[PDB]
Each structure stands twice: as C-alpha cells, then as structure tokens.
Amino acid sequence: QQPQAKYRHDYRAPDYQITDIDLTFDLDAQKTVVTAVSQAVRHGASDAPLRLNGEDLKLVSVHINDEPWTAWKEEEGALVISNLPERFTLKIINEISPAANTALEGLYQSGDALCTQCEAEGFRHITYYLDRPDVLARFTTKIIADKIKYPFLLSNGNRVAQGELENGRHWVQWQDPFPKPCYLFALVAGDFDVLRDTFTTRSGREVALELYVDRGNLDRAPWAMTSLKNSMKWDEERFGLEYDLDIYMIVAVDFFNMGAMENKGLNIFNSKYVLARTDTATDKDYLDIERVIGHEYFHNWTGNRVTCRDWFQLSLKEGLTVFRDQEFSSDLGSRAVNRINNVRTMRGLQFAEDASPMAHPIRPDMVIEMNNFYTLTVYEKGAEVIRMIHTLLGEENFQKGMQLYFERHDGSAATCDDFVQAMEDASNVDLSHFRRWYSQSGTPIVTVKDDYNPETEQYTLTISQRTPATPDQAEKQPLHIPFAIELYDNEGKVIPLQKGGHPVNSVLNVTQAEQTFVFDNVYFQPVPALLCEFSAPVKLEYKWSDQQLTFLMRHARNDFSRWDAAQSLLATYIKLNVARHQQGQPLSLPVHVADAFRAVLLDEKIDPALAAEILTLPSVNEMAELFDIIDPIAIAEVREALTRTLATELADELLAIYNANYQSEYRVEHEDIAKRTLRNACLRFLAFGETHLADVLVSKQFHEANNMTDALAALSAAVAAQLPCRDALMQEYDDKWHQNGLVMDKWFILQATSPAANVLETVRGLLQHRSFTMSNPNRIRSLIGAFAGSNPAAFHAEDGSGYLFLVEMLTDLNSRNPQVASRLIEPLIRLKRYDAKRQEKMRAALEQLKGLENLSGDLYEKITKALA
Numbered sequence: 001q002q003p004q005a006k007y008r009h010d011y012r013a014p015d016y017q018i019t020d021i022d023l024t025f026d027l028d029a030q031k032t033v034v035t036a037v038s039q040a041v042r043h044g045a046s047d048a049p050l051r052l053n054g055e056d057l058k059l060v061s062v063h064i065n066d067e068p069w070t071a072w073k074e075e076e077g078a079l080v081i082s083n084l085p086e087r088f089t090l091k092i093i094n095e096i097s098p099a100a101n102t103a104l105e106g107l108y109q110s111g112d113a114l115c116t117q118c119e120a121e122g123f124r125h126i127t128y129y130l131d132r133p134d135v136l137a138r139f140t141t142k143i144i145a146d147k148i149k150y151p152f153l154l155s156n157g158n159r160v161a162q163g164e165l166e167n168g169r170h171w172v173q174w175q176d177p178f179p180k181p182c183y184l185f186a187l188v189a190g191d192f193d194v195l196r197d198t199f200t201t202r203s204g205r206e207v208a209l210e211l212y213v214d215r216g217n218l219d220r221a222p223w224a225m226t227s228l229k230n231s232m233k234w235d236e237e238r239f240g241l242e243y244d245l246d247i248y249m250i251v252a253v254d255f256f257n258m259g260a261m262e263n264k265g266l267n268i269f270n271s272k273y274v275l276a277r278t279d280t281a282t283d284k285d286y287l288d289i290e291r292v293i294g295h296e297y298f299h300n301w302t303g304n305r306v307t308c309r310d311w312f313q314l315s316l317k318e319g320l321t322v323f324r325d326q327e328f329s330s331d332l333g334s335r336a337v338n339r340i341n342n343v344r345t346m347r348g349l350q351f352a353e354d355a356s357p358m359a360h361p362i363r364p365d366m367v368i369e370m371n372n373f374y375t376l377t378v379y380e381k382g383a384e385v386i387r388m389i390h391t392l393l394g395e396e397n398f399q400k401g402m403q404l405y406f407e408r409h410d411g412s413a414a415t416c417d418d419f420v421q422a423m424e425d426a427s428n429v430d431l432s433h434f435r436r437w438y439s440q441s442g443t444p445i446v447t448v449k450d451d452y453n454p455e456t457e458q459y460t461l462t463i464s465q466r467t468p469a470t471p472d473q474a475e476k477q478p479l480h481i482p483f484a485i486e487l488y489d490n491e492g493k494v495i496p497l498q499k500g501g502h503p504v505n506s507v508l509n510v511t512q513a514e515q516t517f518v519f520d521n522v523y524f525q526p527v528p529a530l531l532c533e534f535s536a537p538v539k540l541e542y543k544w545s546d547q548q549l550t551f552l553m554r555h556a557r558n559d560f561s562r563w564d565a566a567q568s569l570l571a572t573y574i575k576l577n578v579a580r581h582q583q584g585q586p587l588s589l590p591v592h593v594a595d596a597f598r599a600v601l602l603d604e605k606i607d608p609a610l611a612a613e614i615l616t617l618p619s620v621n622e623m624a625e626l627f628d629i630i631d632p633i634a635i636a637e638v639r640e641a642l643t644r645t646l647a648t649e650l651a652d653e654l655l656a657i658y659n660a661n662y663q664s665e666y667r668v669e670h671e672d673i674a675k676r677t678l679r680n681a682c683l684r685f686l687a688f689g690e691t692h693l694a695d696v697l698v699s700k701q702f703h704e705a706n707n708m709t710d711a712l713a714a715l716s717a718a719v720a721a722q723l724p725c726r727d728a729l730m731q732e733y734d735d736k737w738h739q740n741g742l743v744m745d746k747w748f749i750l751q752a753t754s755p756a757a758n759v760l761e762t763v764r765g766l767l768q769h770r771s772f773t774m775s776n777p778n779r780i781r782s783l784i785g786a787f788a789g790s791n792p793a794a795f796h797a798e799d800g801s802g803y804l805f806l807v808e809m810l811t812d813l814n815s816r817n818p819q820v821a822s823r824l825i826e827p828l829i830r831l832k833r834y835d836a837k838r839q840e841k842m843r844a845a846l847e848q849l850k851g852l853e854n855l856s857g858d859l860y861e862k863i864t865k866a867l868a
C-alpha cells in the first residue's frame with residue numbers, strides 16, 4: 001500500500017524528547033554496525049509509547065537503562081516501545097549496508113569513500129530515532145574503521161578523543177555542543193587531500209577552514225576556499241553574524257543527489273560546486289560555486305541555530321537563505337544581472353510549476369514524500385516573498401526584524417509565522433494581510449490601465465488583481481502586492497509622485513481586487529515603468545506601445561527596467577510568429593524592433609553586463625509561459641528564425657562589438673566577465689551568418705580559447721547552428737576531456753539539446769558512452785534530464801518517441817534512485833498544457849509507470865496528481 005499523505009494542520013508536539021545521543025559506528029562498506037545511546041524524556045501521557053522511525057535496518061538489540069527490553073514491536077517503518085518511565089537511557093544496536101544503498105540517502109558509498117545525506121528523513125536509514133526536526137539533541141559520534149582504507153574519519157563538531165586498535169583499525173570521536181535535529185548529522189570516511197586555511201572573525205575568533213577533495217585536486221580548491229572566506233566576511237558586514245565554532249569543514253563528493261548540504265560544521269558538497277580551473281570551468285561555474293558556498297554557510301544561522309518545527313516550514317530556512325545568497329552575489333557582483341536571471345527563473349520555470357498539478361503554496365498544506373517539495377516554489381518564490389518584506393520594511397527595519405527573530409528563537413525550531421511576527425513587531429508594519437502569501441498558491445495577475453487628464457494635470461492608475469484557481473485550491477483571495485512605479489516625462493526625467501500637496505511613496509499597496517491611485521502635479525503625460533525590479537511575483541497586463549518600451553530601453557533609470565522593457569517588446573512578436581509558424585508563414589518583424597537592439601549594441605554608455613542580457617533571447621521555457629497551449633516545435637523554430645533575422649540585419653554591428661570586447665588575459669573578475677558575456681552573446685548571432693564566415697569564426701574561437709568559457713561558447717554555437725565544423729570539434733572535446741566527468745556533463749547537455757533531426761538516436765547511443773553511467777546523478781541529469789526538460793521540441797516529437805524513451809529510463813531509476821527519477825518525470829506532469837494528441841500519448845506513458853512493480857512514493861505522488 002502506497003503512503004498516506006500528511007497534513008500541516010495535524011502538527012502535534014512530540015510525546016518524547018531526546019536531549020543527548022552517543023553514536024558509535026563500526027564502519028564497513030558491506031556491513032556497518034551502529035550503536036546509539038540516547039537520553040530520553042517523556043513529555044506526553046504516561047501510557048503513550050515511544051515511536052521511532054526506521055527504514056531498511058536490521059535490529060540487533062534494544063535496552064532500556066541497560067535492561068534487555070521485551071515490550072516492543074517492529075512495524076512498517078517504525079519501532080514501537082511501550083511501558084517506559086519518564087526518564088531513561090535507550091540503547092539500540094542495528095546493522096546497515098552502505099554498499100547496497102543506490103538511492104544515496106543515509107550512509108552510502110561515493111567511490112571509495114563513505115558519506116551521508118540525512119535531509120529530509122535519511123537519518124532513519126542509519127538507526128531508529130525520532131527523525132523529526134523539532135527534536136534537538138547534543139551529538140557525540142565515535143567512528144571505527146580500517147586505517148589504510150579510511151585514514152580520515154569526520155563528523156560534526158570538534159575532535160575530543162582518538163585511539164588505535166589491533167588488526168589495522170583506528171577510531172576518532174567527535175563532539176558537537178549545539179543541539180540539532182538529526183537531519184544535520186553528517187559522517188565522512190575516506191582518503192583525501194586537504195586544503196587548509198584560516199579565517200579570523202571581527203571579534204577575534206580564529207576559525208580553521210578545511211576543504212577535503214580527492215587525491216590530486218588541491219589545485220582545484222583555491223576558489224572555493226576564497227568564496228568561503230568571502231561568505232564569512234559578508235555575513236558579518238551585512239547581517240552582523242559570526243561563525244560559532246572552531247573548525248569549518250567541507251567535503252567534495254562525486255555521487256550526490258542534492259547539490260550541497262549544510263551539516264553543522266561539516267558541509268558535504270557535490271564536486272560540481274567546489275572544483276574549478278580556468279581551463280575546465282566557465283564563468284558561470286565560478287559564480288555558481290560562489291553562490292552555493294555562500295548558501296550553505298548562510299544556513300549556519302538561517303537553518304541551524306534556528307531550524308524548522310516541521311517540514312511544512314521548509315521555506316522558513318530555504319526562502320530566507322536563498323534571499324541571502326542572492327544579496328551576497330548581488331553585492332559582490334552585478335546586481336542587475338543577478339536580478340535579471342532570478343526573474344527569468346521565476347517567470348520561466350516557477351510560474352509553470354504554479355500552473356501545474358504539483359502547484360503548492362510556499363508553506364505546503366499536504367505532503368506524501370517530503371523530498372518532492374524542494375521546489376522552485378519553496379526556494380525561488382520563497383525568496384521573492386522575503387524580498388517583498390524587505391521592500392515593505394526597508395533594509396534598516398528588515399535587519400531589526402532579523403535580530404528579533406534570532407533573539408526570540410535562537411536554539412529552537414520555529415515556524416514561518418514566527419518569522420513574520422518578528423518582522424512585524426520590530427518594524428511596526430502590519431503584515432497580517434501579507435501572511436496570505438504563505439497559504440495561497442498560484443500566480444497573481446495584475447491588470448493596469450492609466451489615464452492622463454491635461455485640465456487637472458492628474459495621472460490615474462486603475463489596478464486590478466486576480467489569481468486563477470489551481471488544482472490544489474478552489475478558493476483564492478486578493479493579496480498584499482507591493483507595486484513599485486516610476487513616471488518619466490518627455491525628456492526622460494523622473495516626475496515626483498505626490499498627491500494633495502504631499503509626497504507619495506513609489507511602492508503602491510495593491511491590496512484589493514480593484515483600486516485607483518491618483519497623482520497630482522503631473523505636468524506632462526508620462527511614460528510609466530511598472531512593477532520595477534520585479535517588486536512582486538506576478539504577471540503584469542498593460543497595453544504597452546512599442547514606443548513606450550523603446551523609450552524605457554533608452555531612459556529608464558534602473559538597468560532591470562531597460563531589460564524588462566525589451567522582454568515585453570519581444571513577447572508581442574514571439575506570439576505573432578508562433579501563430580504564423582502554425583499557419584506555414586515565415587517570420588515577420590517590424591523594422592523599428594530590430595533598430596532598438598541595434599541601438600543597444602552601439603550605446604557606449606550602457607553597462608556591457610546589461611547589454612549582454614538584453615541581447616540574450618528568452619529560452620524556450622520562458623517563451624512557453626507566453627501561451628495558453630504550448631506548441632514546442634513552433635517555439636523552437638521561431639527562436640532560431642528570430643536569431644537568424646537579427647543576425648542578418650545586425651551583422652556588421654555584431655562583428656564590431658564582438659571584436660571590440662576581445663580580451664587576451666583571462667581573469668575571473670566581474671568587469672572581465674561582463675565583457676566576455678557581451679562578446680559571446682554576439683557570437684551566438686554571428687554563428688547564424690553566412691556559413692563560410694560563421695564556420696571560420698566559431699572554429700577559430702574554439703581552437704584559440706585560453707579558457708573554458710570561450711571554448712564552450714564556440715562549441716555551443718557550432719551545435720546550435722549545425723555548422724560544418726561541429727562533428728570535428730565535438731570529437732576533439734571528447735578525446736581530450738572524456739576522463740573528467742564534470743567537463744563531460746557540458747558535452748552531454750549539448751548533445752541532448754541539439755537541434756539535429758537525429759538527436760534522440762544520438763542520446764540513446766550515448767547511454768553506452770565511456771563517460772556516462774546510470775550510477776551517477778550528474779551524468780543522468782546532463783543527458784537524460786537535459787533532453788526531456790531542455791529540448792521540448794524533441795521530447796515532444798509528434799511520434800511520441802520522446803515519451804517512450806523517458807518511460808524506459810524511469811523504469812530503471814524508480815528502483816535505483818527514486819529521488820533522481822522524481823526530478824526527471826516533471827516534463828510528463830505538464831501534459832495538460834499541450835494539444836490533445838500529445839496529452840493522449842503522455843497519459844499512456846504515465847499509466848505505464850503507474851503500474852510498475854514497487855512504484856516508489858516519490859513518483860506515485862506526481863503520477864497521481866498528473867492523471868487526476
């Protein structure tokens with residue numbers, strides 16, 4: 001029987017608490033023996049039994065105060081112990097097999113090392129325990145292993161004991177003084193190179209930093225170490241927070257499902273977010289390592305010192321920590337580029353999730369498998385909700401709320417409501433209506449109409465809002481939407497906002513279904529910038545003219561507004577030509593639209609970081625969100641045709657800007673990164689010029705590149721334009737990098753996203769490639785996931801071959817690695833967005849998976865919602 005769902009309104013405090021736990025591991029890959037001594041305290045009724053969670057455990061013994069216990073019974077996923085006193089010592093001994101753990105949750109094998117992953121509910125795969133985040137205990141961990149095979153034995157906290165044994169075994173004991181929920185426990189055993197450094201806090205605490213990597217990779221760790229130090233200094237300056245322990249350890253592992261994990265004092269990272277060298281890593285990799293390193297470090301306060309009362313409160317730490325890593329990257333790098341890409345993700349990927357059968361509020365109300373809810377909504381929309389609080393309060397009040405949040409809840413497990421109340425009490429801003437953002441799903445739609453009265457010199461905005469019903473909620477109500485505006489006159493000068501002789505704040509409080517806002521002393525009919533900086537996560541409906549948008553592309557004060565205006569301009573003609581493609585007609589584009597992008601290329605006063613993003617066309621997933629019914633083949637071909645048209649009309653300007661931004665020296669510095677993004681944005685268009693010219697330029701950049709950023713941009717362009725040099729370049733890349741999995745991932749992504757007519761045939765053949773393996777999540781997502789998620793034109797082939805391919809892959813991964821399978825099934829859940837003939841084939845595919853033997857709960861939850 002598949003699992004029953006759990007509901008947020010059923011939360012009840014635990015009948016039993018555990019205050020301290022002493023763990024002993026006798027490590028072995030085939031068999032590990034765990035001994036756990038816990039000090040327990042009963043808070044519930046005297047006749048309530050102790051219910052411990054446990055999965056795939058071989059129980060060996062159960063003692064209460066050293067007495068072998070007889071009043072216990074094992075049930076599905078639990079050990080139930082009865083007739084207990086109010087205080088006692090529980091001792092459990094059980095066995096596990098890390099070598100058989102292909103799901104990568106609990107204690108498992110990563111190559112030759114042993115490591116753990118315990119969030120959300122993985123610790124119960126190690127021993128019987130109260131595997132819930134509102135139980136906080138002080139841990140002490142003793143590890144015993146073969147010295148030659150496992151010379152390094154790591155756990156949370158500080159080393160407090162160590163010894164050697166006979167038969168070549170040794171041991172180390174660790175102690176972590178901060179109580180924690182078990183999902184923050186970590187253990188690592190293996191042989192590593194160690195990069196060691198130090199960081200001194202502003203108050204004088206010296207912290208030892210230790211980065212563990214595979215033998216031979218010390219020259220790939222310096223940037224990660226630098227990013228850690230940068231994270232520690234920034235948190236002090238911006239939030240006034242210092243690290244609270246003596247050591248900070250990071251371990252890079254090749255086999256990892258969840259990107260990275262914030263285990264107290266012992267983070268475990270996917271190698272993709274640690275290792276970097278200029279010849280193997282791109283600018284995006286460097287900046288991703290920075291953001292992930294920061295994200296995990298910032299969890300030390302927003303997550304660890306204050307954790308979650310229950311898993312429905314996940315956004316309490318993830319939304320706030322994402323917001324923190326966004327501010328970190330924005331302060332240190334380009335704020336405009338960070339915001340633009342964060343908005344592309346919201347519009348392009350999160351809106352669709354909110355328009356799917358899996359839609360949920362940032363604080364879910366119902367969950368079957370908690371691992372299915374580490375989502376764009378909980379993370380990305382969660383951060384937008386935090387940012388809206390920052391917008392309503394301001395930086396000063398916002399930090400006051402942070403400090404009150406920590407004062408009240410440091411050392412406990414809190415809820416989302418606790419956080420909002422702290423911000424409300426500290427700032428004196430009423431957030432009662434704002435709380436609805438936590439409980440209501442779906443994307444609000446904000447409609448705006450304006451009117452200028454020359455007689456009275458008044459400008460009136462009539463703003464309405466509505467949220468369409470979602471599969472999970474039939475009731476929707478208006479929200480508190482912060483709506484930021486700016487009014488520009490005929491010269492591009494900002495018009496002061498005022499009413500009745502008093503200034504009016506530029507952040508409007510849109511709180512009702514319909515409302516009017518009147519402004520005085522509007523001397524000239526203005527051009528509005530609406531929803532500035534994406535001030536709320538909503539869809540905007542305003543009948544722009546092409547001239548208003550090109551005006552904003554020229555005169556808007558904030559760089560984000562200039563990019564946003566260009567997106568609105570493109571959207572109108574993306575929709576035009578998709579309709580034309582469906583009727584067999586070629587692309588049509590007014591002359592004045594191409595000229596607006598010509599002016600961007602030739603504007604010497606525009607930040608090249610911004611110009612590069614305006615010259616980056618929306619992705620196929622961003623384009624899909626513009627349509628009621630997705631035609632993935634028309635979207636893909638219209639994107640190419642638009643690229644070809646602009647490449648021909650702007651050929652001369654593109655080549656000039658491309659040559660002007662050449663850089664002989666390669667530096668990982670934001671100004672250098674910006675020029676390089678603008679150069680490679682021009683290269684995308686130039687690849688679609690005359691064949692002989694494009695093939696020479698692309699091949700030249702590939703062979704002369706002194707860094708992987710420029711080499712991969714050329715290789716990507718050769719695949720995208722199907723240039724004659726493609727096959728040769730792709731073979732050289734393979735011949736050179738086939739032994740480096742991280743570098744080959746980029747190669748698989750290009751194969752899976754290729755516009756070639758035989759892409760599926762090539763993808764299937766790559767299942768036997770020397771660098772691919774179904775045992776590594778990174779390889780799976782780079783080839784299979786990129787195909788189903790990032791090549792919808794091929795995944796949605798009219799013959800249904802894409803659906804059948806994915807069914808085969810998921811049949812394997814459902815038994816091997818359900819967590820990775822659940823991420824790969826997401827393209828099938830969106831069937832209702834497509835045409836009826838495609839829906840029929842996709843339902844048939846879901847029905848096949850629905851009838852699998854040993855269907856995991858991960859897929860059962862999604863399949864059930866999809867077929868409803």
Ligand SMILES: [NH3+][C@H]1CCc2c(Br)ccc(-c3ccccc3)c2CC1(O)O
Binds near residue numbers: 258292325
């Ligand atoms: N608590 C863990 C859960 C694992 C997880 C998943 Br699943 C998906 C995305 C991220 C992540 C998001 C942003 C930056 C870096 C990483 C994480 C890491 C985490 O949130 O620290």
Ligand code: NA
Binds near residue numbers: 330331332333334
């Ligand atoms: Na900055």
Ligand SMILES: [Zn+2]
Binds near residue numbers: 295299
């Ligand atoms: Zn996180």
